[PDB]
Every structure is written in C-alpha cells, then in structure tokens.
C-alpha cells in the first residue's frame, strides 16, 4: 500500500478536462474509414470562405432584397452604404464568420471584404470603399471618407473587388460581443464619379458583397453563442 | 501512459495542425494566380 | 489564347462549348474517381457502363422571371430516367456515381441578374409544417423536373422558401457549398465537377439522394426597355465513373 | 510566422485586388496588396479552433428523471418513473446541436459523464443513499419491463453502478454502423411511400435506461439525471451553413412556422452606422 | 556571499557618505562606509520575497451565496439567489488588493479554488447533498436567465461541477487581452465627455454562474461560495506608493471624505522617543 | 488497480500549497508579452530605493 | 505521502472493466489442466459449422 | 487479410459447390466459388468474440 | 504490473488468436478437398 | 512530472534570482561613483 493525499478539487467533474476512461465496449471493433472528400481541421480554414452579407438590412421581415445594396445612375459625391465593423453584431452577425467568431471571446486579424458588380454590362461606373480606423466617427461626406484606408474601385471586366480592413489597433485582440474600448471602425462606401447606364436601360442596379478573414486572424477563448437557445428539451 | 486497453479510452487528441483551407476558399479547376486577371 | 472563357467538355457521345465561361468548380477540389478495393466492402463485382451511362443528359428548360424564386433538382434522382443510367439506376441493388452539372443561361450586354449554382452534400429538406412532420418520399423524388421554390406549399411536401435553403439556414451562407455564380454581365453558364460524397463506399440510388443541385436567381433579373421578361436556363448534367452492382429484379418505387 | 510583410508603395499592371467572384473562389487577399505595411509576427497557432478541441468538452446531452418508491401496486412502473429510458441521441439539446450541424459527417469517440442528484420535496426524515444502475440497451435486446426484471441481471450489456451524488464516467468507442455518423440524410430507410425521411431512420442505436438498485424507504426520492458527452477523436466533413431558425424536432431540419426573422434590421438607413 | 567586509580606520578625501540627493538615485552606501565593520555572511538569499512568493498563495476574492427553494412562483431566479452571478474582478476585496496596486501592470495564471458550505438556518429534518455547478460565462455569451435555462447547458463554456462541504480547483491562463493586466489606467473607453474614467472599462472579462443542480427539497437551504485566488507565474512591472486610504469602489482609485489622519501623531515632540 | 492508503490531511485546502490543476481554457494562447521597462523581482529590490519619512509627526 | 487528485467516475462499478483484485485464496494451487478433446476459442468458429433450418414453420 | 479474392467466370469439371453433407463436415464454400467477385478486405480481427470476452464481463 | 502475487488476481486473458474451426467444421477420417467430389 | 498538457496548469514559477535595483535606486543618465564627489 503506497501512502497518498488528495488534494482540493478531488471528485470535481470540469467539463473541459481530457483524462483517460474505460471503455464500456472492451474489445469492440469499429468500421474502417474510407476516404470522403471535404475534410475540416480547424475552424480557422473555414472562416476564409466568404459568404454574402445581408448589407441592405432595412427590410422588415427576411428577404433575399437584404442582400442587394442598390446603386443609382447618374448621382455623384453621393454615399453607397454604411456600417460599424462589429463583426460579431448587425449585419456580420449571421454570415459564417460572424457566426463563427461568436463562438469565441476575442478576435485579432485582418478581415477581407469585396463587392462584386451585377449592372449591365454596357454600363460603367468609379466607388470608392474607404475603412475608418477607431478614433474618429462614421465618415459624414467622401471627403471625410477618403482621408482613411479606401480602394477607388473602377467597374470592369474583372467583376469583384476584394477590400482588406488591415488590423488597426492599440490592443492586440479584440472582442466579439460589441465593446468600445475594442471597438473597430467604420466602412463606408460613396460614388467616385457615379453610375452611367447604357441606352435602353433602367432602373437600379446591384452589389452583392461577402466577409471573410485574412490567414492572419486569431480567435480565441471559445464559449457559447447567443445565436441559439431553446426552452424545452426537443424529442422525435 | 494508457491505463486502459481500448483506444477509445484514451484522452483527446492533439491538434491536427493540418489546415488547408484551398478545397474550401479555391475549389476552381484551372488555377488562379494573384494579380493575374481573373478571366482571361 | 486558352481563356478561362471557353471551354469544352466531351463525355461519351456528348459535347458541350461555352465561349463564356468563369472557370469550373470540383468539388472539395477532388475529382471522380472509382471505388477503390481498399474501400470495398460489397463482395460483388461491379459493372461499368462507361460511355453509355457517363455522356450529358439535358433536362427541360426553366424560365427565369423576374418573380422566379429558385429551382432544386436532386441527384441521381434528376436522372432516374434518362436513357440506360436510368436503367442501371432501378435494376441494380447499388450503384455510386459522380457528375459534371453545366447550368446554362445567355442573355445580352443590357440585361443584368445573378443566380447562384451551389451543390449541397446531403440535403435533407425541411417540413413546412413544423414539429416533426416529414417531408414524404414523391415530395423530395421530383425527378427532372426539380422542386420549384415559388410553386406553393403541398402537404407532405417540403418548405420552399429561399432565406432559408429549405432547412433552416440562410441563403447568404450557401457559399460554404461548391459554387459557382452566373452573373449576365460575366459569365453565361456554371460548371461543377461533383466527386462521390457519402459515409459508405456504396448505396442505394433510389431511397437516398446525395447532392441537391440548386439554382437561386439573387440579383434579379433586369431586361432591357421593352425586351421580353424572362430568359430560360437549361440544365445539363452527366453522370461520371458510374458502377452499379448488386443486380436483379428492378425496384418499384412509390408513385 | 509572419503575420503581415513589409511592403511599400505599388504602381503596377498587376492588380492582386481585382477579381472575378463568379468563379467560386475566395481569393486570397492580404492588407500588403492594397495598403503599405510593416512586418509582424503571428505568435499564435490556432490550437483552440482545432476540431478536436472544438467538440471535445463535456456538453449536457440529456436530463432525464426517475423515483424511489413503493412499487407496490403500481401497474406500469416504467410509467411511474420507477426507472425510464432513453432512446439515446444527442441532437436532443441544442447547444452541442448546432455545433455539431457544422458539419455533414462526424466520427469520434464518445465520454459519457452521469451526474444523480435526488430531492425529497416532501417531508422525510432523512436522505436516502440511492445507488443508481444505467444499462446499455442495444437494438434488440430485451427492454425491461418492471424496475427489477431478469433484464437488469445485464450478463452481457455493459452497465455502471454508481451513487446519486456521484459521477459516473465511461467511454464508448464510436458505434456507427457506416464509417461517419450522418449529421444529415436525405433520404429514407426504403423507398416506402409513407416511411419518416431524414436521420432518425439511420441514427438508430438503441437507448440506455437508469433505475435506483435501492428498495424504498418510507419517504420518497426524486432522483434526476444529467448525462453529458465529450467527442475525442473526432473527424469532421464537409462545413455547411451554421443554424439560423429554432429547431423542432430530434432529427429532421424543420423550423417553426411564423418564426421571426433572424436578421437584426437597421435602425436606420442602409448609409447608417 | 559577505554581509559586511571588515574595515579599519579611515582619513581620506574620498567621502562616500556626502552626496546629492537631488539626483534622484539612492546611493549603495553600507555600514562598512562610516564605521570600522567586522566580516560577516548573509546565510540568506531573499527567496520569500520574490515576486512569485508574494503573490503566489490563495486570497479570498468573492464571497456569495445562492439557496435551493421550490422556484415555484419565483418571477426572479436572480433575485432569489436561485442562482447568483460574481462579476468577476479581484479589486473587490482588499487584503490580496493592496498587494497587487503595489505594481502597475501584473501578469499572471490563475488558480481558483472554490470552498461551498451549506447552512440551514431554520427547521430541518436533515442536511441535504447538493450538487453546485459554476459557469463561465464571458462577454458576448448568453447570460443565464433562469436556475435551469438552457445556458446551463454550457456545451462549449466551461463548467465544473462539485458538492457543497468540498471545493473545486482549476486553473485559467492569463486572459487579459494586452500583454498585462493594467492595475491602473488613466484613461476612457473612448473620447466621450461622460464615459466612466479608470479601470473598469478596461478588466472586463465577464462573469461567473453559481447554481445548485438539485431541486429542492421541504426545507430550505443556504449554500454560500467563496472563491480563493493564486497567481501562478507571476510577472510585475513599475512599482508604486503603496495604498494610504481606505477603498471605496472596485476598480477606482477614490478614497473616502472626512477620512483620518494616516500619519500617526507623536504623543510629545519632534525631539520625543 | 494499485493499492493506496490516504494520509491526514487528505483533501485539506492550504492557502500556501503549489500543485498542479486542470486549465479550465484547454488549449487558449495568451497574448504575446511586449517588453515594458521597469520589471520587479524581489520586494528587496524597491526597499532600497529611499522615500521621505514624515518625520514631523507633531501635526 | 504523494498527492493525488481523484476524477470524476471513482467508486463507479461497471461490469466491463477489466482489473486485477486480491486474491481471497492466497497461495491456493488449482488442479492441473489435462487434455480434453473440442477446445473453442472463438464464437467465430463455431458459427462456420452448419445447423438446420425450421424453414416448415408452418405447423 | 482479404475477405473476397476477385474471381471471373468458371465453366469447370471441378465444382465446389456440390457437397455430401451426410459426411458431417461443412465444406468451406465462399461467395467466390459461385458468383464473379471483387477484392475486398476483411478489416477486423473478431476480437470481441473471443471466448474469454465473451464470459469475462 | 501486477500488484498482486496470485495469478488468480490478474486482469482479463488476452485474444487467444487461435481459431481454427476445422475441429467442429470439417472432423472428417479422410480428407475433403472443395471441387473435388464429395463421394468417389 | 506535469501531468497535465497545458502550462497554466503547473506549479508555481522558482525564484527570479534576478535582482538589480539599479533600474530604481540608480536611474541617473551619467554614472555616479560612491565617493566621488555628486557634483563636479
Ligand atoms: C453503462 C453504459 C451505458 C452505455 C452507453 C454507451 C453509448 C452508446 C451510444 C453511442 C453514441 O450514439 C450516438 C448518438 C447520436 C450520434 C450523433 N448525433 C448527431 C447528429 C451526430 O451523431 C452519434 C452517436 O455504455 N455503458
Ligand atoms: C468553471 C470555470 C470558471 C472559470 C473562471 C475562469 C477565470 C476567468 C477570469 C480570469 C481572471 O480575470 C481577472 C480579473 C481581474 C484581474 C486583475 N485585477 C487587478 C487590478 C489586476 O488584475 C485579472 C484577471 O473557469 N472555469
């Protein structure tokens, strides 16, 4: 008999420990693997996939209308759109990486954000996307705007352009859940000349615009998200 | 050290520290370089 | 003067060209490839119809107007009758296959929209009920001509609203799945290579359907001034490294 | 690891930015292709974000509850909780729910913990000390029938026998009969016209059922159990888009009617901040 | 090692004892520099006072209390101690505060212990055995509205489970989100011209869940946690004046109005003894 | 299974004892440490620093 | 004495578990094996022998 | 180990397939000996068949 | 490791991999060989 | 011996013995000698 002592925390159950069990099943074979296309390791190589984000939240109920962001022709100095960076709340919040990064605390990195052009083909037109760094308010006029981070995007061929909000900060992780100590800026985007349609054409045109992250984000410090919750156990 | 004989009794893991995200983010047939126009 | 624009694709006794092409998607970037013996488990030899089951089926036209919601064809369902694969399909036990799906739609330089072409690996359909009701079998079977997600709700049918894609997720994160979008501006059709998905190496083509092939107009369509409203997209897919085995007497299936 | 290069300004016939979405491909994209940049390192590995770690705590999975009491008399003990079953699953609660639907197929290994505690909400003298047995019963085998049937003699199927108040900890190897656990099905067990469509048709593995080894006492005991559950060595394909409605039911992917809708909207224009 | 070297008589123009304080710097002046010292050895090396040591035993940082009652009619778990919350901080108790302020920046892991004892104020038949389950639950993740909500749930936030009468111990990595944890900011969260000033907008790292898992029984029960803290790994930078007045609120500097004199008072002269 | 006996003292809490635990943030990266200048080691460091002594008392 | 910490499961009685126990016959000597003919060691091998079918269920 | 050999087709002299099963033994006839097999592999050793598991728990 | 110096005190035996069914399947006098003809 | 994978879960650090008050007793930007004049 070798003498011991336990010490304080013994018989504790912490659902985050990762100790060795029995099996109940001794000697138990299971099926052999065979080979499916599609493996994931890490969240992390799934939050570069983007996907579109509901922009043009304004609608009262859900409608595909919420991912459009319309574009007028022939205005000019005039603003596209605009939003907070709270990746974790408002428009960001039900994409993949919103919805990801609310599974985690704290967040770090560059996110990538692009607009792909849907107008006519015969049609042309110059925006400007411009990110705001934390410190100063939402820009209030292009002129404002384009003193900050911005892309003069020229409407061509090439359909998408891909913006990167570069990681901007004093602290080098954030949080998810909106807090303004750790708050990340602003995007806006604005007319740079303007929307032309062609002959015989009319009405608005659409953009339709993704997030994702840069291979330079961290997340970290996983706990439970707000986007789900029940109130009673579900049966068959 | 396993105390245990089964496999399934062993304790968690170890990170893959595989990652690859190109099936996911790159799924295109003919290869895409960047800073090469995107259609050609 | 190889652009990623045009394209051609031969199959069997099959040829199909697009001169506006974006590229071509392979799922998970893998290409179709037969069952390995290492992954076997059926003891059966099975058959390989080559060429007279992996050329390219056409389906019947859909038309896209500006009220269009989004259509769902499911897969091998979609083929369940086309030629001899559909043949194989209900006289053998088992059978697996992949595909190429080449969805078609050509407009002019003043028109504009953009649908969405995704491939969704095991889409199990939602009630629209609620509860737990289920969707029945000719609900989630509509063969070539797909589900249309602006036909109304039928009983015993699945939820056709698109926010939702049919199951509770929103239609904004469908870019996780294989895609491909056509944007009238861009492109004039979608290709997607699907390799084999599933957890055993061989099933049943009829009780289980393993890819939904969806296409989702999402910037609407716009014609030019006074042009007729509607465009039609056409979808062909063909079968590829199909094998069937287990063969016998020929499944009769409900309805 | 570096996290971001040095680089400078760009005059260039070569524009990383510009790209072509239709293609399907997310183009990767970094700040040094479209602002100046300095260099930086990671100092960071993405541990935390492996799946294994991702799936790998202790989620409860089920709470269940059953009696110590008199027996005498009572014409369907299964019915008077004298013990209960349950028809084992784990997309019962959604929390681990929805983590788990991120996925189309799962594979790993399963560590069950069983925690007891009983109440005795009416007047008693004391607190019994109750001795739990969970049985594992696998499809067909003989369910039981009263609290103390020949079934309990459990000669060949696993069973744990432990105290309220205590834990009870186990691990099962991964039972599926294919190679993965399906997340999702679609499909049916045979192409029946009326058969159930989904994964309650494949997710078939039986049940497990708990009783009190004690025989009563004057008083009664509640006795509730909370079963969690912790993926080790888990193998996940396939992403898919993450839950957004309420759930309805175990196993199939149906929401709710005049549910409400999901996206936040804007209290205020689309130009608001 | 010498505590002091020998040494004679001195008559030298070499003065170490005459300087200049305005400098700013303390000169190392020893016995040996004014009068004639003899050899002796240190036989010590200063070990219990490494930061590590200073700071490396348990504190008691947080007492609560949460009881089990029938919620039957309770419109507010919350309120009724049904459950509780500890918005997690260590500033609110003062003994372990003092010693921290005495740096500007600390960085450190954690290790908790958390004793629960239970009380039963009125009328018992008995002493019940519950079960208590403490939960993470950090910024951004939901808050737990009722004793069983399905925030309980905890399928990806940590939990642990133990019995009252025992005590439960974890350790937690260094979470602050700089490179330290600042035990002083003289800052705002922002430019606002109202925003609160200090610390407290910046150590927020969330909360803490207690509840107990069992329901009740026919009496009553108190259960009161205290949660002890020890710095493990201990790093400090940039010592200050220690702590003169009493504390007044977590996380500001504020001291109380009409406080005393801290300086105790000669009871005669300057020239007194 | 090996045979143990448990001591006095078995599951007592010493305020003053150093074992290991479980990490309750299984596999959590702290942030990198910048360097700050000013580091203390030994509270026998800053108690040779000298500080004013209110002397005076008599107020 | 060495300190220890017990998990979650101690006590537990599961009666697939597989550990070694005292022995209550200490130094007790079995009788020895002798030759029996028909040792099985697997259930595998006798399922391979063949046994008839009631396939006339009819009664 | 294989669990089927692949095997084509057969137009023999010599046929596995007809026994005399009043010799008392069963004849060790496999799916290879009467329809056209693939290779495939067994993938389990039949471990929890062993007779000591099968009376050990 | 044992810690206990009876044998009886052991854990569980170990897959005896013997197998062989040929005791029980085929105890014929003289040998059968499949494809040849049962009775000559 | 840890017993356990991550480094928040060990023991307690082990003495600094590092030690140098000169940071804060002697933080002047030309050198000082004990016995040499303050100032010069
Ligand atoms: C005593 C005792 C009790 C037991 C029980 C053993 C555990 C058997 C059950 C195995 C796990 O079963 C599953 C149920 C559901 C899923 C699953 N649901 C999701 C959609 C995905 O996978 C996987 C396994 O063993 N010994
Ligand atoms: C179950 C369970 C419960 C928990 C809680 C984990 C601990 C998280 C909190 C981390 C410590 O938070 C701090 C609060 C204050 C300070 C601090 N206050 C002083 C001024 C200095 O530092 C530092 C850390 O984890 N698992």
């Given at each position: ?78 603003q ?38 849907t ?9 400007i ?7 100063a ?47 990340a ?52 | ?40 | ?91 053998h ?65 699945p939820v ?11 239609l ?27 957890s055993?190496?061989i ?25 007729t ?5 056409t ?21 | ?9 760009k ?60 027996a ?35 594979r ?44 309990w ?97 175990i ?22 901040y």
């Amino acid at each position: 008999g070798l003498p011991t002592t336990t010490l304080p925390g013994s018989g504790q159950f912490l659902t985050t420990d990762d100790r060795q069990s029995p099996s109940a099943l001794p000697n138990y074979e299971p099926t052999p693997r065979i080979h499916i296309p599609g493996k994931v390791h890490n969240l992390l190589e799934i939050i570069q996939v983007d996907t579109l984000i509901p922009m043009n939240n304004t609608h009262t109920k859900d409608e595909v209308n919420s991912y459009l962001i319309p574009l007028n022709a022939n205005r000019q100095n005039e603003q596209v759109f605009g939003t907070n960076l709270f990746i974790g709340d408002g428009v960001f919040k039900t994409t993949l990486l919103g919805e990801i990064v609310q599974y985690y605390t704290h967040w770090s990195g560059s996110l990538r954000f692009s607009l792909m052009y849907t107008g006519p083909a015969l049609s042309s037109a110059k925006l400007i996307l411009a990110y705001t760094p934390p410190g100063a308010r939402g820009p209030q006029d292009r002129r404002e705007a384009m003193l900050g981070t911005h892309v003069v995007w020229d409407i061509g061929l090439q359909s998408t352009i891909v913006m990167t909000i570069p990681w901007t900060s004093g602290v080098q992780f954030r949080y998810t859940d909106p807090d303004t100590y750790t708050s990340a800026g602003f995007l806006s985007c604005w007319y740079q000349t303007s929307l032309i349609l062609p002959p015989e054409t009319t009405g608005q045109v659409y953009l339709l615009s993704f997030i994702s992250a840069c291979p330079d984000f961290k997340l970290r410090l996983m706990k439970d998200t707000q986007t789900i919750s029940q109130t009673v156990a579900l049966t068959e | 050290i396993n105390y245990y004989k089964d496999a399934a009794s062993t304790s968690s893991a170890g990170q893959s520290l595989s990652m690859d995200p190109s099936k996911f983010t790159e799924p295109v047939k003919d290869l895409m370089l960047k800073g090469a126009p995107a259609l050609n | 003067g190889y652009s990623d624009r045009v394209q051609q694709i031969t199959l069997g006794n099959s040829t199909i060209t697009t001169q506006e092409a974006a590229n071509a998607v392979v799922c998970y970037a893998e290409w179709p490839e037969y069952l390995p013996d290492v992954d076997a488990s059926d003891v059966n030899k099975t058959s390989k119809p080559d060429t007279s089951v992996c050329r390219f089926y056409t389906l019947d036209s859909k038309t896209w107007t500006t009220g269009s919601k989004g259509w769902c064809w499911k897969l091998p369902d979609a083929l369940k009758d086309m030629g001899v694969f559909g043949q194989n399909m209900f006289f053998h036990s088992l059978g697996r296959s992949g595909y190429t799906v080449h969805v078609q739609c050509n407009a002019t330089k003043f028109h504009s929209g953009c649908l969405l072409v995704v491939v969704i690996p095991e889409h199990q359909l939602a009630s629209h009920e609620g509860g737990n009701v289920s969707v029945k079998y000719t609900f989630t079977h509509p063969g070539e001509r797909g589900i249309d997600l602006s036909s109304a709700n039928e009983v015993g049918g699945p939820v056709k609203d698109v926010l939702y894609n049919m199951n509770g997720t929103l239609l904004g994160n469908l870019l996780i799945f294989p895609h491909q979008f056509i944007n009238l501006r861009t492109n004039n059709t979608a290709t997607i290579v699907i390799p084999y998905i599933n957890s055993v190496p061989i099933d049943s083509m009829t009780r289980h359907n393993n890819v939904s092939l969806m296409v989702i107009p999402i910037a609407p369509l716009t014609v030019p001034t006074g042009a007729t409203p509607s465009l039609p997209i056409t979808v062909t897919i063909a079968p590829m490294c199909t094998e069937f085995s287990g063969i016998r007497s020929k499944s009769i299936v409900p309805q | 690891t570096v996290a971001s290069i040095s680089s400078g300004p760009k005059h260039t016939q070569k524009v990383p930015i510009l790209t072509a979405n239709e293609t399907g491909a997310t183009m990767p994209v970094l700040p040094s292709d479209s602002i100046e940049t300095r260099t930086t390192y990671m100092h960071f590995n993405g541990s935390e974000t492996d799946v294994e770690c991702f799936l790998g705590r202790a989620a409860c999975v089920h709470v269940t509850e059953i009696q110590n009491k008199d027996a005498t008399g009572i014409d369907n003990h299964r019915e008077a909780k004298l013990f209960n079953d349950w028809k084992i699953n784990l997309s019962s609660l959604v929390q681990l729910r929805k983590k788990l639907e991120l996925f189309t197929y799962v594979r790993f290994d399963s560590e069950y913990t069983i925690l007891a505690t009983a109440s005795q909400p009416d007047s008693a003298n004391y607190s019994s000390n109750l001795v739990v047995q969970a049985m594992y019963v696998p499809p067909g085998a003989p369910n039981p029938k009263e609290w103390d049937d020949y079934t309990w003699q459990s000669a060949s199927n696993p069973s744990v026998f432990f105290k309220v108040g205590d834990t009870s900890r186990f691990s099962v190897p991964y039972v599926g009969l294919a190679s993965a656990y399906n997340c999702f099905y679609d499909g049916y067990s045979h192409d029946d016209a009326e058969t159930q469509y989904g994964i309650t048709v494949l997710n078939h593995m039986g049940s497990m059922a708990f009783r009190i080894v004690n025989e009563h006492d004057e008083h009664k005991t509640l006795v509730k159990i909370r079963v969690y559950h912790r993926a080790k060595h888990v193998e996940a394909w396939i992403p898919r888009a993450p839950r957004a409605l309420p759930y309805t039911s175990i196993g199939r992917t149906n929401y709710p009617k005049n549910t409400e809708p999901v996206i936040k909207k804007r209290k205020g224009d689309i130009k608001s901040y």
